[PDB]
């Protein structure tokens, strides 16, 4: 499966994302309005991937058109990037099980974790700026890249492209906030702490939302949703939790408390305190 | 030294009342009473914890730990 994400306009960009979601996921019965839903990634065998061709960095122009992302389908992780001009797939070290036919695969020493990427990039995601201009710069940095080890500029490029492709696929909130940067005003998208927290809690959210049945709220660690419009405005695509990211510990996805659906592990993590006087004096 | 950074794979309440966590394949114990519910909360929510100690071999003790959301 090959898809284009076209950055030409907010319309082309959101259309591209929506088409991908439609093809790879199925709406949750209870979190769906029209064709706008929280969707569960359809099961594929491990190692299944789809390709994303990056288009439209220069609005409606057939240039800057040699970057492809390889995305593991079950988890939406970017496994690496393809320079289609050189026919070279630069693959992160945690995706040696992803085989792409027809390309030269460069297995890199660098793993795809945000911790590693942010270190190599010297760039924290919280406060990271993305604009059309810096996506063109990212494109150029990835096309110039060669070798088995991520450089600083190639890592910054991957941070930006992953945010605006895979993370936006997962999170309507990121799609909505970033797409402003594609308008003729060309403002800057700044990733917020909240955006980052959303990405970090994707597996936990995925384990909780399939249990939602119209409760007045949803609480998953630091994440709060207060109505269905908050859910839909924030989340678009979740893992199929019925992946190792679905479960932390225990076997109880949710507890309903006072008409709010809680991740059970969150409640357990603040209901495990002993008597405060005894705690504080038992030093 | 920053001995280990990762999720708590298991925790154990020991006979001597210390508390052991497994992080990044290595076991560390602490006698700090304040840390016992904190560590379990980190395990329950899959926090990334950083064990800091003067020795990092498995079976080392620690009294310093960072709880991260990333």
């Amino acid at each position: 499966r090959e898809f284009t994400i076209d950055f030409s306009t907010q319309q082309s960009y959101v259309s591209s994302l929506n088409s991908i979601r439609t093809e790879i996921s199925t709406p949750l019965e209870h979190i769906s309005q029209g064709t706008t839903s929280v969707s569960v990634i359809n099961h594929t065998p491990p190692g299944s991937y789809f390709a994303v061709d990056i288009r439209g960095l220069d609005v409606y122009q057939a240039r800057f058109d040699h970057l492809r992302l390889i995305i593991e389908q079950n988890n939406l992780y970017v496994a690496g990037f393809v320079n289609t001009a050189t026919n070279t797939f630069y693959r992160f070290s945690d995706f040696t099980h992803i085989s792409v036919p027809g390309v030269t695969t460069v297995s890199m020493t660098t793993d795809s974790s945000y911790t590693t990427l942010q270190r190599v990039a010297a760039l924290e995601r919280s406060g990271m700026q993305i604009s059309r201009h810096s996506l063109v710069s990212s494109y150029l940095a990835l096309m110039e890249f060669s070798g088995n080890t991520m450089t600083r500029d190639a890592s910054r490029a991957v941070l930006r492209f992953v945010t605006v492709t895979a993370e936006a696929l997962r999170f309507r909130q990121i799609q909505r906030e970033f797409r402003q940067a594609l308008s003729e005003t060309a403002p800057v998208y700044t990733m917020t702490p909240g955006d980052v927290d959303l990405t970090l809690n994707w597996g936990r959210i995925s384990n909780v939302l399939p249990e939602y049945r119209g409760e007045d709220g949803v609480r998953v660690g630091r994440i709060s949703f207060n109505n269905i419009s908050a859910i839909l405005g924030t989340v678009a695509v979740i893992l199929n939790c019925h992946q190792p990211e679905c479960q932390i510990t225990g076997d109880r996805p949710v507890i309903k408390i006072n008409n709010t659906l809680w991740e059970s592990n969150t409640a357990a993590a603040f209901l495990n305190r002993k008597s405060q006087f005894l705690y504080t004096t038992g030093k | 030294a920053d001995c280990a950074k990762g999720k708590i794979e298991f925790s154990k309440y020991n006979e001597d009342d210390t508390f052991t966590v497994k992080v990044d394949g290595k076991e560390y114990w602490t006698s700090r009473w304040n840390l016992q519910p904190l560590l379990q909360s980190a395990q329950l929510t899959g926090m990334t914890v950083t064990i800091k100690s003067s020795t990092c071999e498995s079976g080392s003790g620690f009294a310093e730990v960072q709880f991260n959301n990333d």
Partner: peptide, 4 residues
């Protein structure tokens, strides 16, 4: 931690 979280993979990209």
């Amino acid at each position: 931690r979280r993979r990209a």
